[PDB]
Amino acid sequence: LEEGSYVRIKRGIYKGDLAMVDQISENNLEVMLKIVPRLDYGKFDERPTFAHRAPPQLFNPTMALRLDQANLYKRDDRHFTYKNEDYIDGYLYKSFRIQHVETKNIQPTVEELARF
């Protein structure tokens, strides 16, 4: 597990998705991951599940501004907090337990070769 390398997420709506390791935590049990988000911009709001997850697409802050500005906070250059998650230059940065990522024998998919 090294910063800058790829892992596959094992839990949640991002289960199965490829992610870059951004930062290994001080407590040595977590890892901040850079992830292509799966968002709806609050479209049908009044717990998401893996089975019903959205398609992956980079975060679009102007789309968030247009559709759900109440939940959008600018934090820095290219950094927004949207619905209490952080997006920097379009990617989600989210902490996962190291035990919830796969670091070994990852096989990039056709789709991942096209993207990354």
Specify Rg, calculated over alpha carbons. Answer: 15 Å
**Biggest sheet descriptor:** 8 strands, antiparallel
Helix content class: 10-25%
Strand element count:
8
Global morphology: globular
Domain unit count = 1
In what range is the share of β-strand residues? 25-35%
Cα(first) to Cα(last) distance is 19 Å
Helix/sheet category: mainly beta
How many helical stretches? 2
Query: What is the N-to-C succession of helices and strands?
Result: EEEHEEEEEH
Q: Largest beta sheet: what is the strand line-up? A: 4-5-6-7-3-2-1-8
Give the arrangement of secondary structure elements.
Blueprint (H helix, E strand, L loop, with lengths): L5 E4 L8 E7 L5 E6 L25 H8 L3 E5 L2 E4 L2 E4 L2 E7 L3 E2 L7 H6 L1
Antiparallel strand pairs: 1-2, 1-8, 2-3, 3-7, 4-5, 5-6, 6-7
PDB class: transcription
Keywords: transcription, elongation, RNA processing, protein-DNA interaction.
Assembly: monomeric
Question: Quick gist of this model?
Answer:
The chain has helices at 61-68, 110-115; strands at residues 6-9, 18-24, 30-35, 72-76, 79-82, 85-88, 91-97, 101-102. With 116 residues, the chain is mainly beta. It has one domain (1-116).
Q: What can you tell me about this protein's structure?
A:
There is one protein chain. The chain is mostly beta strands. It has one domain (1-116). It is 12% helix and 34% strand. It is built from two helices and eight strands, in the order βββαβββββα. It has helices at 61-68, 110-115, and strands spanning 6-9, 18-24, 30-35, 72-76, 79-82, 85-88, 91-97, 101-102. The protein has an eight-stranded antiparallel sheet with strand order 4-5-6-7-3-2-1-8, covered by helices on one side. A hairpin with a 2-residue loop joins strand 4 (72-76) and strand 5. The radius of gyration is 15 Å and the shape is globular. It starts with 5 loop residues before the first strand and ends with a helix. This is Transcription elongation factor SPT5. Residues 1-34 form the KOW domain.
